[PDB]
Design an enzyme around this catalytic site. Structure first.
Site, PDB file in Angstrom:
ATOM      1  N   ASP B 349     -50.693  16.654  -0.617  1.00 43.77           N
ATOM      2  CA  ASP B 349     -51.641  17.526  -0.087  1.00 43.77           C
ATOM      3  C   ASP B 349     -51.183  17.923   1.199  1.00 43.77           C
ATOM      4  O   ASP B 349     -50.398  17.244   1.976  1.00 43.77           O
ATOM      5  CB  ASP B 349     -53.016  16.677  -0.020  1.00 43.77           C
ATOM      6  CG  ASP B 349     -54.243  17.323   0.450  1.00 43.77           C
ATOM      7  OD1 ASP B 349     -54.714  18.366   0.009  1.00 43.77           O
ATOM      8  OD2 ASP B 349     -54.893  16.813   1.646  1.00 43.77           O
ATOM      9  N   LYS B 460     -63.637  39.590  21.167  1.00 43.92           N
ATOM     10  CA  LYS B 460     -63.730  38.257  21.819  1.00 43.92           C
ATOM     11  C   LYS B 460     -63.003  38.021  23.072  1.00 43.92           C
ATOM     12  O   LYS B 460     -61.775  37.916  22.802  1.00 43.92           O
ATOM     13  CB  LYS B 460     -63.305  37.409  20.987  1.00 43.92           C
ATOM     14  CG  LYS B 460     -63.464  35.799  20.948  1.00 43.92           C
ATOM     15  CD  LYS B 460     -63.134  35.037  19.596  1.00 43.92           C
ATOM     16  CE  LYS B 460     -63.665  33.706  19.856  1.00 43.92           C
ATOM     17  NZ  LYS B 460     -63.072  32.871  20.810  1.00 43.92           N
ATOM     18  N   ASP B 690     -55.893  13.146   0.906  1.00 44.91           N
ATOM     19  CA  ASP B 690     -56.887  12.355   1.678  1.00 44.91           C
ATOM     20  C   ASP B 690     -58.051  12.744   1.525  1.00 44.91           C
ATOM     21  O   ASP B 690     -59.136  11.924   1.437  1.00 44.91           O
ATOM     22  CB  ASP B 690     -56.384  12.724   3.275  1.00 44.91           C
ATOM     23  CG  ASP B 690     -56.262  13.979   3.268  1.00 44.91           C
ATOM     24  OD1 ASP B 690     -55.375  14.680   2.904  1.00 44.91           O
ATOM     25  OD2 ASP B 690     -57.276  14.495   4.337  1.00 44.91           O
ATOM     26  N   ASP B 694     -58.901  15.527  -3.706  1.00 45.62           N
ATOM     27  CA  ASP B 694     -57.594  14.726  -3.941  1.00 45.62           C
ATOM     28  C   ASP B 694     -57.925  13.434  -4.743  1.00 45.62           C
ATOM     29  O   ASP B 694     -57.354  12.743  -5.315  1.00 45.62           O
ATOM     30  CB  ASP B 694     -56.796  14.310  -2.856  1.00 45.62           C
ATOM     31  CG  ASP B 694     -56.209  15.057  -1.968  1.00 45.62           C
ATOM     32  OD1 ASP B 694     -55.928  16.475  -2.303  1.00 45.62           O
ATOM     33  OD2 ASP B 694     -56.456  15.373  -0.493  1.00 45.62           O
TER      34      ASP B 694
HETATM   35 MG   LIG Z   1     -56.859  16.752   2.732  1.00 43.32          MG
END
Ligand SMILES: [Mg+2]
Ligand SMILES: *[C@@H]1O[C@H](CO)[C@@H](O[C@@H]2O[C@H](CO)[C@@H](O)[C@H](O)[C@H]2NC(C)=O)[C@H](O)[C@H]1NC(C)=O
Ligand SMILES: *[C@@H]1O[C@H](CO)[C@@H](O[C@@H]2O[C@H](CO)[C@@H](O)[C@H](O)[C@H]2NC(C)=O)[C@H](O)[C@H]1NC(C)=O
Ligand SMILES: CC(C)CCC[C@@H](C)[C@H]1CC[C@H]2[C@@H]3CC=C4C[C@@H](O)CC[C@]4(C)[C@H]3CC[C@]12C
Ligand SMILES: CC(C)CCC[C@@H](C)[C@H]1CC[C@H]2[C@@H]3CC=C4C[C@@H](O)CC[C@]4(C)[C@H]3CC[C@]12C
Ligand SMILES: CC(C)CCC[C@@H](C)[C@H]1CC[C@H]2[C@@H]3CC=C4C[C@@H](O)CC[C@]4(C)[C@H]3CC[C@]12C
Ligand SMILES: C[C@]12CC/C(=N\OCCN)C[C@@H]1C(=O)C[C@@H]1[C@@H]2CC[C@]2(C)C(=O)CC[C@@H]12
Ligand SMILES: *[C@@H]1O[C@H](CO)[C@@H](O)[C@H](O)[C@H]1NC(C)=O
Ligand SMILES: [Mg+2]
Ligand code: NA
EC number: 7.2.2.13
Lengths: 291, 996, 32
Positions: B349, B460, B690, B694
């Site tokens: 990931d 901005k 995480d 996942d």
């Molecule tokens: Mg993650």
């Protein structure tokens, strides 16, 4: 996935033919070498032992005390009438005493007439092969009175009041030593304490000792034991057709239709006992003459 | 009918977000500025359930205990124990004075499985016992507007269809439909995987509810600003709720180590039943009746089952698992410690796993030169040149003009891991000045701020005027920051080493290519500038009220740009290199934007420098992408927009022809489909994630690897291995220990499988040659459950014979744990020598006591008889029952000792599969103790007072300890020369037939 | 007599060996 039997690219049971031959040839050579090695070492082992004496003899320190009717449970149960009930006993007794007939002990070159009286031990030199084949003292069936007879091919034994002879375990170089004249309460026995190994039978408890009325022993010259003139043993190689001493025991006054226990204990200094082996030194039997 | 329920969760979610404000309020019956009455709120509360995910399915402790008593290996010992009581059922009723050996054996096998279950259960439960110490679920009350008033209530007390307000820092309770936002930026990191804080605007933007900004999501935190929203989804129906429920409802699969256990038993019993049946037929051919032959069948099969192998294997796996816990790499499953070694494809990931999931200052621009800042989590990288006036000016513009500061407790925490309030960009700037430019505390209060101008919705720009406390110049210092395209218009001067220069195109175009360099690297770029206000035209008392032109927007002095992005973890790139070196195909799977996913993959090693994508080839030739051949591109980027309209065959083709693959913008469900596609290849897949996205990927994966702190709780429970330290290098440590214990298990297995031949051959020829029993049962237990326990376990402490991180991943269908080579050595050759050595000691003792080896033939007929107390030996002597039985038992005890003697060399040779004992070396201290304990314990089992009374093991005459010496030495010689030929001839004979 | 074996002496030596070899193995795994 379990049909790997064959294919058009050559495989049998999992591998090809050339591979099967290579593996089989290797295993044959390998196992052949293994067999040759085990045989060579076992041959060296055979070369470490002699032909006239076992190297270790401590596992037979206390000799056993066996009987002629090798019962399935040391029990003698039969009928005084039915001849087929006690056939298994008589068959074993006749086959055991088949080598003690006067015709079996006929060659004077291998047999020696010991004597009608038990004498001292007979040592025929050392155990080596420097001397020829030693002589074996004769033991005619007549010594066991009332349990031998002059019967035909079938020894018509005792239906009522049976006979049970006892035998001392044949041990090489074993010299039996009877107890000293200072006998520590050994149950009425004859005064022939120096040249015979005493053997006395009895019940097992207050009940068996009362049921068994009278016992009559028979031996060499009338002594309840084994004569010292037949010992020691010099192995089967040097003394083939050897006849160890025998001693018969008859139970005259028994309580018919009752199983009673008898313990025939052999006494002596060189005779040990064992609480685990009821046969080392002593001997047990369960007699029951059910009518 | 739960099959249909799972299929409604693997589908991508749908919504009704794209609706007018009036339509949403009517459909939900909710006031927009007031919410609803509290009675209506309680009515829904007691209707669909409180806003909270249903607790995980509780797993009672007796369930998993009975679980450890079953399985696949313990099942073999169970059927064996049953066969012992079955054999005893036939034996008791049929023979006289039956022996208590079979009953002794049946209860022992039952005890083996029970103790193994208790030990393994204590270890698996210990993993969960420390995992429960991580549930620091702090109750978080939500700010809901009901009846026109604001009220803070528990998240579970929130219902559907009511106004909810969130402050910058509050975690979004349920899924909301934003109705009014004001500079609100949410963090969709833990859910969809979007790294930079995605802002939330009430206006509907994308057809996908994940990309749109009018939706606040469950388990997401509000970074900055405030916003309002109507509760649309609640409880388990929420986005991450349906993802969590999906993860709990997915299959776990069959671990590769368990599959090896099953294939192991397939051969153990295959030969056990082959020997038992073929010998059953042989026994009936001879003389044994059906009554006795049935017992022969059971005895031969039951002995061929390694009883002590279950405990040794379990402890063998437990030892490696212990090392995993030492390095803060916990395994929730005792066997999952092996899965890393068998892995051949890791699906990682991006956000949170590979990267730190935190905006950090990446590079700086000064004097037309790029300066890379240290981006390591532990701060152990290269430090830029911090001794220039351009650096001090740029650092002051960032440290001063930035709406970001620390907090209360942030005093002892490190400079990076501490908390910062405000924008993620401003937070990164604060962490870099507090680390490379002293401290921003005194550096900020030094230049007193008069009037500030925060960021604007358009153009901005963020500027502010400060006083200059330098002991030389009293002119005011004006600072400004913003996008490079919004500051280039408001600049005319350029700072270089201290002096200013005009906006010459020779250095201004050099600024544009640098802006395109940091931007092309997947980072967010900002521009910092300052100017000295003329105090002659703006005195020290003039108040620069924020209304009109008090500061020159143009003519400013630009210093340089400052880029920033979430950097990869410290040991992540090196770890990726180790896995690719080990032959593991690294595949990035994330829901992040492709612009950053490709750059991060380039920086970690998933994409090699030089390889081009299908799009890169076209851009290099100035041609359309549809022309290039995909076979020319080794790597390829796959967008989730295109993955949705794909088939299984197409995904297979992507994995087959592309070695370096990066899946970007993939939904959590697509993460599951990607892992399923890699599993179709038959390769072992490991997923490292995480966030909650996942969870469905880690659960279905052969092994899920989660982060101990930076990972969401859902994916942390659905995984099989947790990294409490979040060190991604633990994956490399895992693959190393996995292959290590796999080969060490092969050695330990071959050791226990070698002792089998001398354990059964006595009973085999006992039936054939009709000789007295060469080896007893109790004596066999002293080997399989006594002495050999230490050498088998000590065989786990073996180190690598060669570099394990250099060999390719083991093929599942090819490299089996136990193959015909290992059996050819254990059951065929080594164990064979052990069997013949045992028979040597057998004949030796009997012949020396008067029973010549040739005379023992057909002796068991009268030997085993209990009443024939006058059996003639070879010298004519008469042996009673116990006199000869004492010899048999004192012939079983040295046979057992003979086994230990041959096990000395068997342990030394099994210690090394290929290297020589002189090469590997007897440095295994546990193995040395394995030999000392095994030998001393063996002597204790023979010479202790009472062994011949309890275990029927009598003392040995000292000459028996050497009857087996040449056999062990021969085993050592033959196996040593075998591995020697394997070294000099790595061709085929000694390697394909003997090497295992 | 050659029918007596000094089992007590051999047994005594076997236990002393079991004591020495075991404690030395303990010293082996205790490299300090
Ligand atoms: Mg993650
Ligand atoms: C052997 O058996 C015979 C019987 O055939 C016994 O002879 C009897 O002996 C008693 C004395 O004890 C005499 O009163 C009888 O008249 C004898 N009968 C016969 C037919 O001879 C003989 O006693 C037994 N021998 C021993 C040693 O007990
Ligand atoms: C042989 O045993 C019998 C017992 O079976 C003895 O005779 C018994 O003597 C008791 C008195 O003590 C009487 O009450 C019984 O009626 C007798 N029974 C018979 C059958 O006579 C007998 O004395 C024993 N004889 C010898 C020589 O021991
Ligand atoms: C009691 C006695 C007669 C049984 C004799 C069994 C012998 C002949 C059997 C037992 C184990 C067998 C071996 C088992 C293993 C291997 C390797 C395999 O790839 C081919 C067969 C081969 C090479 C076998 C050869 C024959 C063998 C050695
Ligand atoms: C029939 C049998 C006993 C004879 C076989 C010869 C054996 C015992 C001899 C042949 C070659 C020898 C080895 C030659 C090479 C090495 C490597 C060196 O660094 C240490 C010595 C060592 C380890 C020797 C040990 C003994 C050895 C293995
Ligand atoms: C191959 C070599 C290095 C291994 C070293 C261990 C050998 C030498 C040891 C291991 C077990 C030992 C035996 C252990 C038990 C006994 C019984 C005792 O009453 C006399 C010594 C005797 C007979 C030992 C002789 C030496 C022996 C065989
Ligand atoms: C239990 C036993 C068969 C039954 C037996 N005695 O059966 C006669 C009862 N009168 C004792 C034997 C042993 O002690 C040794 C046993 C053997 C079965 C097969 C065994 C269990 C083995 O694989 C190794 C030991 C073997
Ligand atoms: C034993 O003692 C008795 C008298 O108590 C005696 O008659 C006999 O001869 C002695 N026998 C021996 C061998 O001394
Ligand atoms: Mg075993
Ligand atoms: Na799993």
């Amino acid at each position: 996935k379990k049909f790997i039997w064959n294919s058009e690219k050559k495989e049998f049971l999992g591998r090809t033919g050339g591979s099967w031959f290579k593996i089989l040839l290797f295993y044959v050579i390998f196992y052949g070498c293994l067999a040759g090695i085990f045989i060579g070492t076992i041959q060296v082992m055979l070369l470490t032992i002699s032909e006239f004496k076992p190297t270790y003899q401590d596992r037979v320190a206390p000799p056993g005390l066996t009987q002629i009717p090798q019962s399935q449970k040391t029990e003698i149960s039969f009928r005084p009438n039915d001849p087929q009930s006690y056939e298994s006993y008589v068959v074993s007794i006749v086959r055991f005493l088949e080598k003690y007939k006067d015709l079996a002990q006929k060659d004077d070159m291998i047999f020696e007439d010991c004597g009608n009286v038990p004498s001292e031990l007979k040592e025929r030199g050392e155990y080596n092969n420097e001397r020829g084949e030693r002589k074996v003292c004769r033991f005619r069936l007549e010594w066991l009175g009332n349990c031998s007879g002059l019967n035909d091919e079938t020894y018509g034994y005792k239906d009522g009041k049976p006979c049970v002879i006892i035998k001392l375990n044949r041990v090489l170089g074993f010299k039996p030593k009877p107890p000293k004249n200072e006998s520590l309460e050994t149950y009425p026995v004859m005064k022939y304490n120096p040249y015979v190994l005493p053997v006395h039978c009895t019940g097992k408890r207050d009940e068996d000792k009362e049921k068994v009325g009278t016992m009559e022993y028979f031996g060499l010259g009338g002594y309840p034991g084994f004569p010292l003139q037949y010992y020691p043993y010099y192995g089967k190689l040097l003394q083939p057709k050897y006849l160890q001493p025998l001693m018969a025991v008859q139970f005259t006054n028994l309580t018919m239709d009752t199983e009673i226990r008898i313990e025939c204990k052999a006494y002596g200094e060189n005779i040990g006992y064992s609480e685990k082996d009821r046969f080392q030194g002593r001997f047990d039997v369960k007699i029951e003459v059910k009518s | 009918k739960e099959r249909d329920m799972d299929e409604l969760k693997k589908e991508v979610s749908m919504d009704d977000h794209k609706l007018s404000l009036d339509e949403l309020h009517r459909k939900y019956g909710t006031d927009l500025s007031r919410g609803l009455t509290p009675a209506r709120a309680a009515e829904i509360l007691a209707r669909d359930g409180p806003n909270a995910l249903t607790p995980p399915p509780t797993t009672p402790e007796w369930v998993k205990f009975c679980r450890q008593l079953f399985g696949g290996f313990s099942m073999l010992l169970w059927i064996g124990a049953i066969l012992c009581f079955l054999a005893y059922g036939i034996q008791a009723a049929t023979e006289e004075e039956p022996q208590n050996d079979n009953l002794y054996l049946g209860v022992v096998l039952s005890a083996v499985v029970i103790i193994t279950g208790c030990f393994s259960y204590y270890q698996e439960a210990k993993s969960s016992k420390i995992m429960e110490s991580f549930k620091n679920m702090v109750p978080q009350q939500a700010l809901v507007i009901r009846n026109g008033e604001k009220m803070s209530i528990n998240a579970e007390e929130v219902v559907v269809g009511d106004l909810v307000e969130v402050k910058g820092g509050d975690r979004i309770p349920a899924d909301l439909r934003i109705i009014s936002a004001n500079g609100c930026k949410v963090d969709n990191s833990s859910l969809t995987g979007e790294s930079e804080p995605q802002t939330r605007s009430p206006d509907f933007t994308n057809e996908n509810p994940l990309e749109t900004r009018n939706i606040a999501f469950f388990s997401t935190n509000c970074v900055e600003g405030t916003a309002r929203g109507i509760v649309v989804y609640t409880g388990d129906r929420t986005v991450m709720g349906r993802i969590a429920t999906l993860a709990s409802g997915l299959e776990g699969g069959q671990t590769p180590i368990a599959a090896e256990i099953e294939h192991f038993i397939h051969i153990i019993t295959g030969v056990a039943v082959f020997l038992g049946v073929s010998f059953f037929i042989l026994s009936l051919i001879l003389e044994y009746t059906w009554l006795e032959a049935v017992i022969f069948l059971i005895g031969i099969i039951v002995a061929n089952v390694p009883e002590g192998l279950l405990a040794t294997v379990t402890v063998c796996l437990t030892l490696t698992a212990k090392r995993m816990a030492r390095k803060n790499c916990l395994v929730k499953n005792l066997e999952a410690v092996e899965t890393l070694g068998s892995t051949s494809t890791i699906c990682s990931d991006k956000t949170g796993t590979l990267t730190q999931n935190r905006m950090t200052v990446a590079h700086m621009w000064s004097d037309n030169q790029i300066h890379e800042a240290d981006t390591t989590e532990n701060q152990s990288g290269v430090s830029f040149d911090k001794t220039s006036a351009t650096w001090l000016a740029l650092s002051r513009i960032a440290g001063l003009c930035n709406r970001a500061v620390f907090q209360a407790n942030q005093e002892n925490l490190p400079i990076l891991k501490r908390a910062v309030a405000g924008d993620a960009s401003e937070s990164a700037l604060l962490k870099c000045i507090e680390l490379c430019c002293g401290s921003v505390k005194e550096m900020r209060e030094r230049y007193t701020k008069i009037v500030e101008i925060p960021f604007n919705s358009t153009n901005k720009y963020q500027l502010s005027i400060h006083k200059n406390p330098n002991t030389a110049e009293p002119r005011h210092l004006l600072v400004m920051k913003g996008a490079p395209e919004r500051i280039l218009d408001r600049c005319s001067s350029i700072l270089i080493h201290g002096k200013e220069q005009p906006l010459d195109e020779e250095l201004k175009d050099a600024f544009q290519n640098a802006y395109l360099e940091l931007g092309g690297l997947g980072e967010r770029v900002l521009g910092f500038c300052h100017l000295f206000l003329p105090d002659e035209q703006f005195p020290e008392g003039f108040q620069f009220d924020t209304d009109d032109v008090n500061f020159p927007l143009d003519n400013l002095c630009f210093v340089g740009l400052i880029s920033m992005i979430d950097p990869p973890r410290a040991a992540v790139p090196d770890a990726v290199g180790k896995c690719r070196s080990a032959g593991i195909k690294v595949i990035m799977v994330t829901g992040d934007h492709p612009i950053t996913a490709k750059a991060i993959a380039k920086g970690v090693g998933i994409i090699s420098e030089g390889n081009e994508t299908v799009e890169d080839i076209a851009a290099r030739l100035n041609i359309p992408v549809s022309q290039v051949n995909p076979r020319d591109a080794k790597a390829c980027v796959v967008h989730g927009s295109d993955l949705k309209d794909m088939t299984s065959e197409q995904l297979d083709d992507i994995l087959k022809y592309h070695t370096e693959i990066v899946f970007a913008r993939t939904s959590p469900q697509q993460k599951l489909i990607i892992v399923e596609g890699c599993q179709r290849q038959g390769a072992i897949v490991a997923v490292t994630g995480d966030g909650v996205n996942d969870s469905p990927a880690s659960k279905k994966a052969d092994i899920g690897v989660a982060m101990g702190i930076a990972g969401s709780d859902v994916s942390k429970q659905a995984a099989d291995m947790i990294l409490l330290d979040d060190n991604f290098a633990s994956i490399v440590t895992g693959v190393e220990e996995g292959r290590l214990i796999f080969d060490n298990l092969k050695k330990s297995i071959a050791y226990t499988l070698t002792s089998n031949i001398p354990e059964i051959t006595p009973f085999l020829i006992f039936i054939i040659a009709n000789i007295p029993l060469p080896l007893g049962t109790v004596t066999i237990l002293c080997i399989d459950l006594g002495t050999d326990m230490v050498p088998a376990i000590s065989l786990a402490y073996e180190q690598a014979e060669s570099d394990i991180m250099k060999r390719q991943p083991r093929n599942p269908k090819t490299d089996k744990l136990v193959n015909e080579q290992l059996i050819s050595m254990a059951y065929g050759q080594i164990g064979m020598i052990q069997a013949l050595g045992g028979f040597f000691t057998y004949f030796v003792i009997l012949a020396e006591n008067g029973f010549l080896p040739i005379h023992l033939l057909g002796l068991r007929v009268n030997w085993d008889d209990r009443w024939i107390n006058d059996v003639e030996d070879s010298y004519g002597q008469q042996w009673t029952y116990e006199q000869r039985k004492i010899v048999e038992f004192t012939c079983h005890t040295p046979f057992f000792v003979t086994i230990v003697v041959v096990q000395w060399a068997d342990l030394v040779i099994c210690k090394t599969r290929r290297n020589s004992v002189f090469q590997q070396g007897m440095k295994n201290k546990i193995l040395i103790f394995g030999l000392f304990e095994e030998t001393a314990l063996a002597a204790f089992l023979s010479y202790c007072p009472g062994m011949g009374v309890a275990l029927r093991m009598y003392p040995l005459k000292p000459t028996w300890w050497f009857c087996a010496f040449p056999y062990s030495l021969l085993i050592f010689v033959y196996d040593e020369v075998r591995k020697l030929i394997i070294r000099r001839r790595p061709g085929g004979w000694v390697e394909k037939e003997t090497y295992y | 007599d050659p029918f007596y074996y000094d089992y007590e002496t051999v047994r005594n030596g076997g236990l002393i060996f079991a004591a020495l070899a075991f404690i030395v193995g303990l010293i082996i795994i205790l490299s300090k």
